[PDB]
Symmetry: D2
Subunit: 78 residues, 4 copies
Amino acid sequence: MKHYFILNFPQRPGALREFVNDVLGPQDDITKFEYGTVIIGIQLKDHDDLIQLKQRVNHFDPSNIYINENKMLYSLLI
Amino acid sequence: EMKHYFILNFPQRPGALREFVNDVLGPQDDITKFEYLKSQNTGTVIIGIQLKDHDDLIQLKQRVNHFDPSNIYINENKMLYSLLI
Amino acid sequence: HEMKHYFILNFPQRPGALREFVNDVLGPQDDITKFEYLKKSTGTVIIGIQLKDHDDLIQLKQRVNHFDPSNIYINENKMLYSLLI
Amino acid sequence: RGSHEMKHYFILNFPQRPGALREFVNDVLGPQDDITKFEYTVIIGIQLKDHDDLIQLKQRVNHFDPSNIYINENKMLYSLLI
């Protein structure tokens, strides 16, 4: 239910405003935002919405890295 | 000053970052720094905000005060500005 | 011009653990170039080391292994080196 | 807390020259003084075994970094950073 990513936020201004209002859903909530590599944890109301979120993250940052797929990154970062 | 810096004890209310971006922040305003200084995910964060216009600073401070009543404006303390920025 | 070695260690919470790493684990000719945390609840740290004698690297990894058996040599993993350096 | 506080915190500008941490661990610190914190300008915490040893530690810290800031004096700096 808590899914973690690693992104390189664009230096383009208003990117986080674009991320909150477009990349994420209304019921989705950011649970982590630690440092331009940024670690971010997002909680999902339903697991059936994860795949579409992954696609939107790839549009925002093609350099995105899903943490939960690599166990070592999960143990080290989370 | 077009870049302003604050100290906030981020509320545990869900969607706080969305609340800060859409309500505490202006549509033409951007955040330039988001760095914790405390540790856990529950922590004290140092935030930097850039305003489109300086006239919106007084009203911005009030929005930050409603978000975290114990917030601290750094730009008006030379000691904290020199140490944290 | 120079080569450095970065490690991930679950640094023991015992007091004086850094003196042990500097004196017992690290050779007198070797120096530390990076000490940065990755998480807390203050466990994981990235420690970068510059050795004057590359031939002593094998012995270094042993002393790091005895210090923290959870040692991870960052330089081996491709994804870890690019992400963390 | 005239002689009963054993955890003391400082803000130092570490020289980026080699062996600085070895110089700080051996030359600056005392034999019974143990490090308790080191986070990035770096905030450092040391626990003494004897409060009388504090004077010498502060003197040696001033030599290492004249720009050092003993945090415990400022209750504000103590609250925000610890």
